[PDB]
């Protein structure tokens, strides 16, 4: 029951989804061929939430991988652990979006979302009781950004009374992967603010800092980055995937962390992160787990929480622990660290505890903070977009495929209004 | 029916009590784990009786550092004590009166008083408290002075005996001993009924000549101090021809409200080999307890006068030769009494001979004497300590540790004038009275 | 309970510390791999004071080894008995201080002081009830004397109600290991006199004479020199690690040995010290232990006590003895040798007794005397500093990295003030 439909967009979505399904199959004891090989029955107790049963006791993921360029699909099909996805779900075009929001939203988007919506409707009607949607993408690319936006809009139109999470790879401030980032970032963020429910912003430079400093890795790669992101996502889902002392669901998290309809940009974090050599010199316990959780250096978004106030915080533990210790340490953290907590939201900490530890670990924890440090990211993106649009660069290639400057002005106004409201609620008494 | 509880404060109190409760468990035939293998009850005054055959002591062990309580928790007397009674802190007072009386000892006093109330309410015929504490320590001299201010308020008028450890003139460990002792005496002078003094140096000489030993560790000294403590409360737990309760010492040894500092004495103290060649009669153990080389405080009674005395015999003792021996003692001119005390002797005879612990230095005897004398000669002990305090305070040495830990410089002056008045009173009334 | 944090700065501190944890491990029966191997259960009764319990019954020392150059950490990490320290605590820079105080207190030490302080703070929270700090450094180097002072000032600003000790190695009159010794020593003492509770001063040639005429050694290397210091370092702490007849602790000593806030410079000592060949011709007993430690020949600081008077004296015995024998002789020593004891401090002797003898000995002790003869050491350093400062020799690489002439003239007036008050109390009546 409570099935979740997973949608992956662009190269980043495809790679992150591949790592995510690797982690989920390892967690549920599913062989790469697609048949159960595990030992305990607690894995089989709730497997329909992500997987889907099929004849000869096979299990097929409920994922819909789609991207305009066929290279990622060919890679995921030819590589290992590609024998279990359903080929019908493999949807692709011929020519990529070319880092163009207009091309990804108005040119290939038409047919691509027609086919994707057909597949989505079939999967949903096959589902018994739909719980929500998951979409992993990037706000910097063309196909991922534009076509994920179109998919989100169509899914919102079709299923108004449903939840969906978006895992967005936000552009970095230091080094830009693409020259025209701000246009796509602004348009995508405007559309998401319009018609999404919750969004977990994830950066790349912050992940690289985490991997180099904490994990002590010399050559951090996209494999490790996607591993970290997938671990965070699995930690998020495990609360309803597995039984526990104090269960939590996606709707519970949304209710507890979203105080206002326009404030759903969270910062994720994971604990514990330790190097291979220095893992036997630490005592795994809730005190040190929370201590590692609640420091800025262990933040997956390139925003320093010391520059803002935590509007709300959620903490999903795993493994076996003591609720007395958990609540006592939460109270201690709140009392010692009151300065950067919002005064008019008393009791601004949500805690959930599961009962199944991750593979090869005694206990872990996932932290999700709705803070006011995203204001700086939105301000930086808005400033870059303002400069680029004022000098009118790269814009005739968004105007030449349907759009106009009215859309850009509206998106910039919406972004500025959002950041102003965010600051004004940070500085409220 | 008659109940009294004992409080052990500091390392000196805990270490002494570790040997005192080894003696009570042997007199009443109590196994170390609380079970059982003049008597009809006996243990009711000290050992509270639980549902099963187990008896638990009426003791409250309290300390600030935990380095000595865990020795009791681990040692052979582990199953005896009630685990909730053993109260311990985090860090010690570090030989500081301010730390163990104003800042660190104030975070634990409320817990200690809870255990005292939970013990007094269970009993019906509570008589008084026994406090085993030192004088030169930090938590044995600053924390025990916080208990009397609180015990004397919750319980109005009850006898509060003490068994102190006076700092010796020559042998001494602490450097700030004159500071701790002066401050403690000035504060406990009003909330105490009778403070017995025992010196560490005097017992060294007693255990060296009489017992003929060469290595008298602290275990040997504590085994001898405990004999005096058990001799005082011998009439409470056993029948006798002439009983003496705890309140008898208050109205017989304290002529004035400020002069309540007797000094203990025990006899006979002989080795195992010397016991065979001695008759051990009543008429000579009385003589042995009166010689100046057997007193347990480093002061000679010859310089002073005996204000009052108290002899507590026990064992095969006849009430006739006790009178004859005492009458001879008064006639001797070595000792002398005060003019305003025509009668200065109080006797008490018990029917229980003293017991001997296995492996003890002392030998089995059938008679024993515990003499508690309130004499003027102890006034020389206050003068010596009052000189040490005035020497260091002139240069204000070590003061900065007390001032910065919750005290004012004026407190040291008040504690000095009080000891000057007490010393003056100890000789003004001990001198001849005109007309 | 009452655990302490060990901080080792400079090269001497790392070399002394590398031999210090060899003694503590042997005392508690800790294998070099880090797992308990001892037999008696009294060793493990108080192990949290120095060691830290980890996963799978592993013990990791509570040490923070830091130095500006990476040369020293190579030896301890790659050498034997380097498999038990935590790699996080290994903090080092790239370029050494170059025997400069300014390069270790303003320029290079400011880069590392924010990283070590994040490990000192982390160690305190995991600690149950902090007792104090321990620092081993040198007064002649650049990082041991410059940066070790910086750590003292910062720690004292965060834990005011704590007691810390410095096992400094004060320079020597006969030979100078570095040409600019007085500039570093004078500038460090001006800071150690304000933010330190007690300081144990140790010379180098005074350890050579002891190893020559008493230990009967011809070629004493630094391995046999740091071994002798470590025994004294482990004798102070042993009172609160093992049960004893008359216990003491770090705070208990500071009350007795420090009459005034500025007079806290001590002179340690050890006994018995006998050659391997000539240990069968002596009876190990208390009367000869006290006789050996009270002569000027057996003192680890090259200052003859006959030129001054002992203010207060400590004596931390070990082994198993009789309390009568100990207290009988310290009266005889005081009575026979009343000429060099201060008059306005009656009973200027503190005695403590433990119950666990050192490894391979029936009994031992440790002598700590706050003598006035230390005055003659500060008089010499202030003499050498004055001669160089007048000619302004070597001064222009201290002014070139932040400092100035006004700073020097205040660190020497304070030094001369201490000497004046260290002598007016020797002749005071
Ligand atoms: N965390 C993470 N991010 C990635 C990874 N691979 C790519 N990205 C990000 O995703 C973006 C790629 O843009 P996409 O949306 O995939 O665009 P595309 O699929 O190449 O097609 P076009 O939009 O037409 O350019 C880059 O800017 C990267 O920052 C990855 O492996 N891990
Ligand atoms: N007779 C006797 N005296 C003892 C014994 N142990 C300690 N003392 C005395 O106690 C004095 C030390 O002061 P204490 O009150 O015990 O110190 P403490 O109890 O550890 O409390 P702190 O001062 O805070 O450390 C010493 O001078 C000894 O004379 C003992 O076993 N027997
Ligand atoms: N007792 C003892 N002293 C030592 C030992 N090794 C070095 N020293 C002393 O330590 C001093 C070295 O100065 P340090 O403070 O270590 O200087 P550093 O750590 O090399 O850093 P720089 O000052 O920048 O060179 C020398 O003057 C020696 O007297 C040792 O093994 N034992
Ligand atoms: Mg592409
Ligand atoms: Mg104590
Ligand atoms: Mg160096």
Swiss-Prot record, chains A, C:
One of its GO terms (molecular function) is netrin receptor binding. Expression is primarily restricted to central and peripheral nervous system. Greatly increased expression in most cancerous tissues. Some glutamate residues at the C-terminus are polyglutamylated, resulting in polyglutamate chains on the gamma-carboxyl group. Polyglutamylation plays a key role in microtubule severing by spastin (SPAST). SPAST preferentially recognizes and acts on microtubules decorated with short polyglutamate tails: severing activity by SPAST increases as the number of glutamates per tubulin rises from one to eight, but decreases beyond this glutamylation threshold. Glutamylation is also involved in cilia motility. GDP binds at residues 10-12, 15, 99, 138, 142-144, 177, 204, 222, 226. One of its GO terms (biological process) is axon guidance. It is found in: Cytoplasm, Cytoskeleton; Cell projection, Growth cone; Cell projection, Lamellipodium; Cell projection, Filopodium. Belongs to the tubulin family. Tubulin is the major constituent of microtubules, protein filaments consisting of alpha- and beta-tubulin heterodimers. Microtubules grow by the addition of GTP-tubulin dimers to the microtubule end, where a stabilizing cap forms. Below the cap, alpha-beta tubulin heterodimers are in GDP-bound state, owing to GTPase activity of alpha-tubulin. TUBB3 plays a critical role in proper axon guidance and maintenance. Heterodimer of alpha- and beta-tubulin. A typical microtubule is a hollow water-filled tube with an outer diameter of 25 nm and an inner diameter of 15 nM. Alpha-beta heterodimers associate head-to-tail to form protofilaments running lengthwise along the microtubule wall with the beta-tubulin subunit facing the microtubule plus end conferring a structural polarity. Microtubules usually have 13 protofilaments but different protofilament numbers can be found in some organisms and specialized cells. PANTHER family: TUBULIN. The highly acidic C-terminal region may bind cations such as calcium. The MREI motif is common among all beta-tubulin isoforms and may be critical for tubulin autoregulation. This is Tubulin beta-3 chain. It comes from Homo sapiens.
UniProtKB/Swiss-Prot annotation, chain B:
One of its GO terms (molecular function) is structural constituent of cytoskeleton. There is a cross-link at residues 320, 364 (Glycyl lysine isopeptide (Lys-Gly) (interchain with G-Cter in ubiquitin)). Its EC number is 3.6.5.-. GTP binds at residues 10-12, 15, 65, 93, 134, 137-140, 173, 177, 200, 218, 222, 246. It holds the Pfam family Tubulin_C. Its cofactor is Mg(2+). The active site is at residue 248. The keyword Metal-binding does not apply. Some glutamate residues at the C-terminus are polyglutamylated, resulting in polyglutamate chains on the gamma-carboxyl group. Polyglutamylation plays a key role in microtubule severing by spastin (SPAST). SPAST preferentially recognizes and acts on microtubules decorated with short polyglutamate tails: severing activity by SPAST increases as the number of glutamates per tubulin rises from one to eight, but decreases beyond this glutamylation threshold. Glutamylation is also involved in cilia motility. GO terms for cellular component: cilium; cytoplasm; cytoplasmic microtubule; microtubule; microtubule cytoskeleton. It comes from the Eukaryota. The keyword Phosphoprotein applies. GO terms for biological process: cell division; cellular response to interleukin-4; cytoskeleton-dependent intracellular transport; microtubule cytoskeleton organization; microtubule-based process; mitotic cell cycle. A motif (MREC motif) lies at residues 1-4. Belongs to the tubulin family. Heterodimer of alpha- and beta-tubulin. A typical microtubule is a hollow water-filled tube with an outer diameter of 25 nm and an inner diameter of 15 nM. Alpha-beta heterodimers associate head-to-tail to form protofilaments running lengthwise along the microtubule wall with the beta-tubulin subunit facing the microtubule plus end conferring a structural polarity. Microtubules usually have 13 protofilaments but different protofilament numbers can be found in some organisms and specialized cells. Tubulin is the major constituent of microtubules, protein filaments consisting of alpha- and beta-tubulin heterodimers. Microtubules grow by the addition of GTP-tubulin dimers to the microtubule end, where a stabilizing cap forms. Below the cap, tubulin dimers are in GDP-bound state, owing to GTPase activity of alpha-tubulin. This is Tubulin alpha-1B chain. The gene is TUBA1B.
